[PDB]
RNA sequence: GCUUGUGACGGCCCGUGAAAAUCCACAGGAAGGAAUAGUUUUCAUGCCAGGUCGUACUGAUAACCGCAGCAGGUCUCCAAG
RNA sequence: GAUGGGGAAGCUCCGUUUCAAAGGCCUGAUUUUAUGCAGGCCACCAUCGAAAGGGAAUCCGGUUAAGAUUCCGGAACCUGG
């Protein structure tokens, strides 16, 4: 079956982002008037969160563990499709096409992914999309 | 044997050749089935099993070089990877495949 | 039926010391020495020239902006974007197999 | 809590870089 | 007299290496802790021609184990290894070519090269292309190992030393005709000045012990004693037979 | 057109040294300038670069071999052996 | 060794301070195919730049110059 | 067309044909810093200093070496119909 | 080719990182004062050796009885601050 879904993590190997983990929000699997190929549009977090530890207390914390998201078109081609996955009901409306066009709406739309990012980041669901992939 | 398999499939049931075009079909689900050359890079078959199991599709290892695989097919090139996404009158998805 | 000299005083055909021939806007030929050519970044992996970075001597780098040393993806002036396309594959499907390693060192502790 | 992670580092050669230990015992004097 | 052209290599002036184009002394790795008590993984960089070699090498990275880096070593490369294979080094390696083991490690018919005479030299013994040792044999008490030289001498060594299995590339290489003094011209510039050779006949009383005469010959034997003394010694030295074999 | 009968490819020494001596070159030169397959690509682009390396110019493999050809006799005889060693001691 | 191109970017050069001096070559050639014009060229002179801006259009030439700025001494041709 | 430069290919080797200073990029994340406002001299422009010894002329059928203003010897670039 | 060492009646020889306690950095700790005390580091450990090898950056026009890619006029560029 189609394991490209709304929920489903993916790790970004071409391009500024390579490397990066994301989450498949509204994939359209054919078809569209420009990107005329399979694509899907995503969301993912572009830093990382510093290592935290016992030791950090205070202000530190809340400065670490900052995250800076993205929301972008990819080709799945470009997508490595992984088993994990998110619950992403959250940001549905605002991860969109619409999103795009009108640029002034992508840092609109940020700020509803970060704010759903920081959150899980705190009650450590989903503690792998939050860890720094290496290579 | 797994020759008489494949052959058999080539006018009775559809098919798809090479490494790029099964991962779309295996991308959408369509695979039922793919064959994977014995001398194929590691980090390739890898990913090709790793599809797979998300997709949960039987993974069968031909035994041979990709030289052999085609001959199987009967294509006169070399092929590293087939995917059959429909299978003919021959019995390749209900045996030991 | 012009000829022209070395405006150096090397005589000899060395390496550095490459001629180009040149009509100055007095009208006469002259020589014009001319410096080593630079050769493109390589990549530290597949050895193929990595494109995107400008072609320059090695100190001729110091003088220029980041933009031309430099691309966007990780590794951008070092591997070659097919070679991070790997690495990234590499280190997710080594990583991956290596954890169902380690669940069946925990089922061969119940099995056995 | 959640944030924070354990990562334990695994000495068993052929891995992680060897921590620092008390090498006094030998030492060239 | 004079002081011969044998006698003359000594001093060592024109007479030494031609160490350029060298890739570097070919060694196996320090012996360590990681190595004797398990095994530590390399993979190999390049497979590279060396000058004045026969044979060529491999260069396999390590990690060093007590600092963040990597260690890249030169090892005389058997035939059959691959840029992009992983080479494993120690007591608990496994036995496939390249993987570098302890003598003790292997069972008897083994096929290894570049071995220790002692544990911790970094390789002597059967380096130069195509060559290899077999072990036929172990001493598990007064721990030693059997196994015969290339030249088809047996000698025992410890059974710590290290080996690394598999016959040395560059096999085949004296199968071909040189074909002309010039193409010896350019083996021999690369390794030292030994070449031409005049034969100590065509040459003067004072040039050698062969020379003068009104016709060429030697005059006495060709046999030297092997308690002859400096410069005396040209030909054939201390020698149990001599003569074509049949 | 196939030229030359017996020389071949020793024809560029012309009459010199000797027809033995010829002839026996013509048996390795053979083996050093030919084309062979490649036990990783599944293609034949080896090729010698030197004595001892042999270059795959597909994937891109170097590897090591014997002096005029790509596997030497008395060593696919060691990986067998040392094939048949290793499992000995784990059967 | 530089060029400018819109007129407004150079009325800025002409007051950047570091410009003590400028200059106006006129030079008589033609366009397209048949027939000549006046072409003037203005140049300001930078501490480590020399700068000029090409008039080919002889309407907009002669409000430029009037609105020169008084301090710059100018050398006409 | 000739001279020189260069690029992509091919041949040859039991010959595979320097080193280093120097400069840059990347990996890493030490730290340091937005909200009444804080940076950045790898974007622009502007500002100051750039020392010591060599520098003439022949380079040869008389300026070099051969007792000399010697038919000898002596490395190299440009090259018209 | 010094040093440390090692020979040598001695002039000096070996050797060049060698059986060596072979060194100065990056800033945190200081706002009594500047740098104590601080953690961490990095172990390559003289120097010499090419006016043809490597290498930061300059061009045109004019000028002298004799000098110029140096002087003049103009147009650039590099490096350290």
Redesign the interface.
Known sequence: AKFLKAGKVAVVVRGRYAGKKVVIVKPHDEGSKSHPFGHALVAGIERYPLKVTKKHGAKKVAKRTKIKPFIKVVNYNHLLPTRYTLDVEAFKSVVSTETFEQPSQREEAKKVVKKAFEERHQAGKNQWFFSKLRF | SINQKLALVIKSGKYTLGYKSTVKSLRQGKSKLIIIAANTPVLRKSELEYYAMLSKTKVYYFQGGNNELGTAVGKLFRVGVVSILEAGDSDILTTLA | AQRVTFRRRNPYNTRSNKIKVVKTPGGILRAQHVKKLATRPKCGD?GSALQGISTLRPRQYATVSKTHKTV???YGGSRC?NC??????????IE??KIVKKVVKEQTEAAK | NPLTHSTPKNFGIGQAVQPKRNLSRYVKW | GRVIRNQRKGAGSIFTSHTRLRQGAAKLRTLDYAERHGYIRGIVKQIVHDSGRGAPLAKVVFRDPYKYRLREEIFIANEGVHTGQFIYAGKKASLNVGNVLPLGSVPEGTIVSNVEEKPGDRGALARASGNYVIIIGHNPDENKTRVRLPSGAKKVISSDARGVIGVIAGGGRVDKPLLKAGRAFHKYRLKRNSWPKTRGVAMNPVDHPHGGGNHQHIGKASTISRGAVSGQKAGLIAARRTGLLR | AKRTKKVGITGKYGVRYGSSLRRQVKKLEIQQHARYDCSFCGKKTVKRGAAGIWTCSCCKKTVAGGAYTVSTAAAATVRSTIRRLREMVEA | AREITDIKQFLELTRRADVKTATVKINKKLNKAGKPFRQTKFKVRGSSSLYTLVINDAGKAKKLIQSLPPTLKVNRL
């Open positions: 597949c966007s993806r990780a974007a991070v396309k790997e690495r990234i594959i590499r280190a997710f499907l991956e197999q």
